[PDB]
Design a protein around this ligand. Structure first.
Ligand SMILES: *[C@@H]1O[C@H](CO)[C@@H](O[C@@H]2O[C@H](CO)[C@@H](O)[C@H](O)[C@H]2NC(C)=O)[C@H](O)[C@H]1NC(C)=O
Lengths: 50, 28
């Protein structure tokens, strides 16, 4: 699931923009890391969850 | 690899294409 984005999605849209985001002057080289966060992450569903 | 299919200088042809709310409409 996507955690953050810089634009809202209109209803019934499929977007191929699943790239990285940057939050610093340093070059991230397209690799996830601190100040180079990735928007897509899992929730790790488990039976004990609410 | 498919989800949907459809089958239906003397000339001037005019078309209008619009796409809103998941609907793709054409006028001719
Ligand atoms: C529909 O897809 C286009 C193409 O990806 C989206 O346009 C991008 O939007 C992001 C969000 O700000 C920008 O950072 C990119 O620069 C835009 N262009 C490209 C080529 O990626 C557009 O946002 C999508 N529609 C909606 C409603 O989000």
């Amino acid at each position: 699931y996507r955690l953050f984005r810089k634009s809202n999605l209109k209803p019934f849209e499929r977007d191929i923009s699943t790239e990285i985001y940057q939050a610093g002057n340093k070059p991230c080289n397209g690799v996830a890391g601190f100040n180079c966060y990735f928007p897509l992450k899992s929730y790790s569903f488990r039976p004990t969850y609410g | 690899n498919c989800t949907f299919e459809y089958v239906s200088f003397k000339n001037l042809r005019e078309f209008v294409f619009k796409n809103i709310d998941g609907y793709f409409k054409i006028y001719s």
